[PDB]
Write a protein that binds this ligand. Structure first.
Ligand SMILES: C[As](C)(=O)[O-]
Ligand SMILES: [Zn+2]
Length: 180
DNA sequence: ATTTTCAAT
């Protein structure tokens, strides 16, 4: 039902903080939802969380999906909520995966942009977009959704941090400059 | 609690 382990609240709060230059976030958290659509069956859903170490989270996701999930005559609507955006090696692997598997649709929401000022990382993001992945920055609604779905929230509402929206606005500006 | 995004020389 749930792939991997949900986060405790302080881990989520730490890891999904969206200050563009945060220090000390060495992990990439990769939360996902997936709609599994097969013609003569009811639609089904899967959700979970991947972390680093097929080493990086993005590659762990691809390897699990191929080994456990991918089936003929099935369409997949996949959404990632990542704490960091991908490195160029991961981006290239995800892009080639998407080229190889036309029945997979990927939407990526990211809290932060990893090395957004580096051209190699910019190209990685571009190549993802060019293979049909939608790349977006997480806003309030996406943080709220992750809190509700991937965190042991103990029925407590999401508490947005100061600067959340301003950070979103800065990061989205950078993303659109990259994707342009 | 007017229940933590925004409230800004
Ligand atoms: C965001 As990464 C370093 O796991 O590709
Ligand atoms: Zn990577």
């Amino acid at each position: 039902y749930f792939q991997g382990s949900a986060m405790d609240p302080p881990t989520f709060t730490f890891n999904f903080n969206n200050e563009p230059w945060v220090r000390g976030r060495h992990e990439t958290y990769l939360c996902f939802t997936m709609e599994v659509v097969k013609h003569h069956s009811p639609v089904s859903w899967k959700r979970g969380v991947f972390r680093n170490q097929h080493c990086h989270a993005e590659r762990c996701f691809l390897s699990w999906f191929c080994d456990d999930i991918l089936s003929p005559n099935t369409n997949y609507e996949v959404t990632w909520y990542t704490s960091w955006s991908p490195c160029p090696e991961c981006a290239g692997e995800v892009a080639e995966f998407l080229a190889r598997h036309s029945n997979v649709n990927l939407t990526i929401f990211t809290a932060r942009l990893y090395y957004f000022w580096d051209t190699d990382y910019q190209e990685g993001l571009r190549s993802l977009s060019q293979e049909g992945a939608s790349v977006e920055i997480m806003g309030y609604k996406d943080f709220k959704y992750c809190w509700e779905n991937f965190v042991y929230n103990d029925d407590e509402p999401f508490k947005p941090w100061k600067g959340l929206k301003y950070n979103f606005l800065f990061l989205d500006s950078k993303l659109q400059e990259i994707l342009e």
